[PDB]
Symmetry: C2
Subunit: 431 residues, 2 copies
Amino acid sequence: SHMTIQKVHGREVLDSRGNPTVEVEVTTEKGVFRSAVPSGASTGVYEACELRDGDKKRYVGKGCLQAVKNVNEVIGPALIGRDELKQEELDTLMLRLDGTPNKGKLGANAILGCSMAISKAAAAAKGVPLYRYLASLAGTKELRLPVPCFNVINGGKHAGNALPFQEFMIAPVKATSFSEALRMGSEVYHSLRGIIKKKYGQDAVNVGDEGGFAPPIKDINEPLPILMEAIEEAGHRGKFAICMDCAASETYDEKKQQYNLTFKSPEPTWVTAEQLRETYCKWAHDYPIVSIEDPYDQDDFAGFAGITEALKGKTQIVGDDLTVTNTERIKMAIEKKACNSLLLKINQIGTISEAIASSKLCMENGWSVMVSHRSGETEDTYIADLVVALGSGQIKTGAPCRGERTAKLNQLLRIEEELGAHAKFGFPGWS
Amino acid sequence: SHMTIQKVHGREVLDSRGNPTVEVEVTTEKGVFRSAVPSGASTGVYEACELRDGDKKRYVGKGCLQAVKNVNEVIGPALIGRDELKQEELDTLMLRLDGTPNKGKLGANAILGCSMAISKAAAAAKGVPLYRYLASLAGTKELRLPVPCFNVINGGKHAGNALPFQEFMIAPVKATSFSEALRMGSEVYHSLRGIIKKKYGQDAVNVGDEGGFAPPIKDINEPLPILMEAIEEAGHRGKFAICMDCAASETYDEKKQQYNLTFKSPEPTWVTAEQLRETYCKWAHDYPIVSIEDPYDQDDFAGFAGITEALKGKTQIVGDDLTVTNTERIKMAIEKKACNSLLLKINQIGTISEAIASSKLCMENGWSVMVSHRSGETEDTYIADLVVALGSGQIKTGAPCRGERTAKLNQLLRIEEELGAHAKFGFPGWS
Ligand SMILES: [Zn+2]
Ligand SMILES: [Zn+2]
Ligand SMILES: [Zn+2]
Ligand SMILES: [Zn+2]
């Protein structure tokens, strides 16, 4: 009877780039449950509304005071006295309280932290860790520790360099435990620093938004041999796969219908999609490239489809800006066989219930699901419990560097330890 | 009666550079209390022992399995059934269990996380937040939110550049609240990115270990005008002071008795201490330089003393590698008037009780105390509660960038909010 939501409180906190974001605390008799909202830099146009203040006098327009106010004065008062166990009911209340398709009234950033923190309070009421609670909500038959995909050379909007494509990842697919995966990842990362420093010098080993090295590289092919060399030097030959996120929307010009591979440089380098596919097929034959995210513009369903079929069985194609963790956009991707993997970003959609529905839809149609961070992260570790709960076997959450990335990896170590040596690890299709 | 320590468990986790460190959980009836140990790169020779495995097959010798084992098999079993409220008694037990001056048997890294987590479990038993509990332990008369000293241009061992000196900091000394201080810090940080990128180009805006920019700067004077320009452009002229950490030990050659200002470069640049003092006095007259940490080698008590007196009243001189948070080394610094400020690093000494004794000794003799992170940090936020509890008014915990830095700043926002608008902010001598 006294087992309901007692208090809801939002505040403005800083993310890992130093920009304001929203954090929410749900207080019950079982404690104070705290969830912070991440923020993207390379954001799809179809993402749910991230609500900013636009006051040029605070954080040059990036304050989240309005979203915080919406938590404190609108959403909070509606949740007091409510049964936190009713995830779908409460998520649906919050959708209706908003009343708009994109969460543009209240903000996906106001709503999401409430959604998240409600589920923490509920897990606690059930007497189970978050990952167990969410796996019941998602109807997951089998927990697993995922293979981490470590963005170790950073480009695009996440890094100070000419490099046009955003993410060059290494994934220890042949590890047999999360423990071993994390150590192998870290070990290759440390070898990679020496390789980059020798090749490009001292000034090349500083880090991007996601903890990856940001070398002075322009050419999109150039990182790949450096990744293989790092893998080998660490003692891990044969044990790794490569994952790519091109984030190609960031380079696309809609009026020219072409991709600028030097958009962060003075002169432009225009490239057709048919010249992009030549490059991708060449990646996939040359390297253990098991995943390619956003190989095309977020509305190029045809390019997406073409490359999903030409690489079927070798290389999964991941919708991120394409799908934006949204069942409507997913349904279009399914219909056109545009891709075969979902990048799941809770803040692309804005409720836990919706993000879970997105995962179930995609896995029912045979896709994989890679739970993801945003490039602007916090100390929050929700996505660690979330990927385990969904049983998907794939997470990208950064290089093994920078606390807003390592916090997630460490939370995965804790979950691992709780589940014991019988706990499943990895993505079966890559193992 | 059932109010004792129930379980103690250590594990290996990753720090913000991706290196292993120790984390400890103390379980009581009131919950699971978790504390992780930080790690330095520019470590004084007088620091308590950080115990590593030296197995070149795991993390090229950097594993903390032995320290974790010492927690799990030696320290843990001794704490079960003990009253967590007895901080000094338990800290002293752990010192005796070690039995060596430097904590070289068990490891300062094994001991410290136990110390920390015991105090969290105790705060919980007392029914008060950590900062309140620690302020009672320290006998603090007045809580305060500190002015943060944001290391925004990174050099030395924390960055990929020629820059020999380690830390160039900005401190919003004229803010009237922690909220405003953090926002001003972030705002100047964002202006600074544009200034560096325009001057040095795109490749210059990637970040060092502590979230500061790592531009291609060699000259130790060159960051200072760039800091002033950033302060001004953000709208904050007159509101900031500069804090320096030279970490000069890292450049010192004992055999030559000189400082190499190009030790990360092919050719050496040898400089006398009398040429270093010329530079410091010039800094202090030219800029609002309110703090200079480790201006000399960790054993140059004479250089330290000379510059403490020549800059008395303008610029505090901070012992870090000099003092290593150790009452023995502090007593020598007091005797020679070597410095007038302590950089307090809990893991330089290895118990909470000792770190507190160090703070009280220094403040009783009239010094300031700047609570500090290490360059290898975690998601742990202990030092946020610690600086508030000690009432010292000064913290350095990184640029407002990278989650292992922003986690501390955000925890300071939470404490601020708990204490209300009557809560004291800042270092009175700088306000
Ligand atoms: Zn993106
Ligand atoms: Zn993406
Ligand atoms: Zn140091
Ligand atoms: Zn220092």
